[PDB]
């Protein structure tokens, strides 16, 4: 079993990276006077998906990848996008989170070799340059973005708990599939910053259920949970969805790469 | 370049410095650990400061960080604060100041006063306490062992056991093997929470005579034949009744090729531990042994022990494993 898995409720996820929602739009008003809301959205969608691509590429799990993802939203729900290039910072996180287990120190020449070719083969409608960073921008950046976290690496995520409530239903082979690849989608929104990784793992297992017609309530009323938090995850859930069918990225990405905010060079 | 101007100046103003706000220069004690005291004396407190060896962060320091920033029990060793120094990409940890050891605790009373027996108990209740806390969290330790076993010394924590891992090379490496569970000796791949106890049971027995229980005279492979002659000496050959799967270990043909039971048959831990003036119907004894039981799934668990009846007969152990006593054992050198 892993490692501090019993901790949440004395961890620093939850006592220091559980945000506040108002503070977090509150910091995100430095980067909207150059991106819209939408665009801001459409934004973390795409680079929630560069992220996938880079762990696909390294043949990580998807905790791996959960967590790289979870460190780099960290980042930029306190910094502007125009602090650290985005570009450098995705592949620092999967660096990072790889080191976090054992098998994990990704080699140089491969972290390298993963950011350009996912970046030139998946994302050239994005990016028509090459990926220009080097192994010492990455370990620059690696710094950075340990100082802004204080050194929190432990990430809890929505699997584990998903899990053992899908085998408590007896229904593991139904369910788990759907519902798993509904807390994925999860990690295109603010949801893991703002609640407790089992009850995002219960919202997903909801959506699962009403999409393949199954009758879970009984078992729903049984748990002793705020269920007022959990149906307002399920709004968001719901309209992730509605977002994604609206959303060409492909057509729109490099306009909406080219509105966000540029770093001030030295004098 | 390519990085924001305001944002890393901004950054680099407000970042602490290690070195602007701790005194440590000519301090070390032990990469590199120093004894430290702050500049802006808020407070009085003695600080151990550690650099971790090498630059950037690599696999083994990564996940250590990780793990010591989520651990919080008194009975270990807590990480206060990680320093990050951009210029030479060094890590500095920063922990409150243990005095003493169990290694120079013991070497004090081995050198012509045996261990208070009052103290010994509470020593290993802390160890014990300690070590469930990790191993309830899945952490295991993997390198036991009474220097690793730090106490505290005068201040609000006088006497209290904190556990560590004072940076000693793990298995051409220097190291001891007498700390070290028979399955490991015969080529177990992985660790386990049973080897911890173990090496407890070791450092337990270690406590009630002053010397190593397996005691034997740089090196690469896991198989020790001396080592496991020593424990032999002192336990006696295992039965396959009292270790069947003992035949599943890879160095197990090894053992039959290089051992007969026979040269063991007078061999036991009991005849061990009185001939050191320990009673082996005493409930000390008793602990002892199922703490030392040669099988892995043969060895009781922490919280088990730690309700062992040794620990509600008189003496009850204390918070302060001293007991109110003046602390004769002498403090760290400077190097
Ligand atoms: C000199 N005086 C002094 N007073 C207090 C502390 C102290 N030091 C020096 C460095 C040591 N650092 C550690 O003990 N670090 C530490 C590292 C790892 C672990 C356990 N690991 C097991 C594998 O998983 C990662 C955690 C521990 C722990 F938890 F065992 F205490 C401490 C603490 N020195
Ligand atoms: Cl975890
Ligand atoms: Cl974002």
């Known amino acids: 079993d892993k490692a501090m898995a019993g901790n949440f409720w004395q961890s620093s996820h939850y006592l220091q990276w559980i945000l506040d929602k108002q503070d977090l739009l509150k910091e995100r008003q430095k980067d909207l006077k150059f991106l819209s809301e939408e665009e801001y959205w459409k934004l973390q969608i795409f680079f929630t998906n560069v992220i996938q691509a880079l762990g696909e590429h390294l043949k990580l799990r998807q905790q791996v990848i959960a967590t790289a993802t979870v460190y780099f939203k960290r980042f930029y729900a306190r910094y502007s996008l125009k602090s650290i290039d985005p570009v450098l910072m995705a592949p620092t996180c999967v660096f990072l989170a790889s ?43 690696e710094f950075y973005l340990l100082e802004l ?34 807390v994925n989608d999860t990690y295109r ?19 699962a259920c009403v999409v393949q017609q199954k009758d879970a309530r009984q078992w729903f009323a049984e748990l002793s949970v705020d269920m007022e938090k959990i149906l307002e995850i399920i709004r968001v859930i719901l309209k992730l969805y509605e977002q994604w069918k609206n959303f060409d990225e492909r057509k729109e990405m490099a306009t909406i790469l080219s509105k966000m905010p540029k770093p001030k060079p030295p004098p | 370049d390519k990085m924001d101007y305001d944002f890393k ?54 996940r250590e960080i ?12 807590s990480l206060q604060k990680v320093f990050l120094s951009h210029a030479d990409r060094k890590v500095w940890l920063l922990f409150d100041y243990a005095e003493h050891d169990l290694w120079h605790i013991i070497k004090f009373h081995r050198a012509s006063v045996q261990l208070p027996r009052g103290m010994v108990k509470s020593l290993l209740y802390q160890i014990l306490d300690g070590i469930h806390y990790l191993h309830a969290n899945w952490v295991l330790h993997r390198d036991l062992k009474p220097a690793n076993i730090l106490v505290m010394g005068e201040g609000p924590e006088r006497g209290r056991v904190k556990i560590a891992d004072m940076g000693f090379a793990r298995l051409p490496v220097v190291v001891t093997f007498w700390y070290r569970a028979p399955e490991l000796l015969l080529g177990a791949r992985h660790y ?58 890879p160095e197990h043909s090894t053992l039959m090729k290089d051992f007969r039971r026979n040269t063991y048959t007078n061999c036991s831990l009991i005849k061990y ?29 922490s919280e088990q022990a730690m309700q062992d009846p040794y620990f509600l007969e008189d003496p009850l152990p204390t918070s302060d494993v001293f007991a109110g006593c003046q602390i004769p054992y002498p403090k760290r050198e400077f190097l």
């Open chain 1, 99 to 141: 080191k976090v287990e054992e098998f994990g120190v990704v080699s140089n020449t491969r972290l390298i070799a993963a950011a350009t070719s996912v970046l030139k083969t998946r994302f050239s409608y994005a990016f028509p340059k090459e990926f220009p960073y080097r192994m010492n921008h990455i370990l620059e950046c």
């Open chain 2, 273 to 301: 531990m009185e001939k050191h003036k320990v009673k082996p119907d005493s409930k000390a004894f008793h602990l002892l042994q199922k703490l030392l039981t040669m099988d892995p799934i043969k060895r009781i668990t």
């Open chain 1, 189 to 207: 929104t603010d949801l893991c910053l703002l609640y407790p990784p089992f009850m995002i793992a219960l919202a997903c297992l909801h959506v």
């Open chain 2, 9 to 62: 100046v901004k950054l680099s103003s407000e970042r602490e410095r290690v070195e602007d706000l701790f005194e440590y220069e000519g301090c070390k004690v032990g990469g590199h650990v120093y004894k430290a005291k702050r500049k802006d004396g808020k407070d009085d407190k003695d600080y151990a400061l550690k650099q971790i060896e090498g630059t950037g962060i690599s696999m083994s320091a990564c």
């Open chain 2, 66 to 77: 990780a793990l010591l920033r989520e651990l919080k029990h008194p009975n270990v060793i």
């Open chain 2, 192 to 249: 386990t929470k049973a080897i911890d106890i173990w090496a407890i049971g070791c450092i337990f027995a270690e406590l009630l005579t002053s010397e190593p229980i397996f005691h034997c005279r740089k090196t690469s492979n896991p198989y020790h034949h001396d080592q496991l002659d020593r424990i032999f000496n002192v336990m006696g050959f295992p039965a396959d009744k009292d270790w069947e799967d003992i035949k599943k270990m």
């Open chain 1, 149 to 182: 976290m204080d050194c929190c690496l432990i990430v809890y995520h929505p699997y584990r708990p998903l899990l053992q409530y899908v085998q408590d239903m007896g229904q593991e082979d139904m369910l788990l599939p759907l519902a798993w690849r509904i």
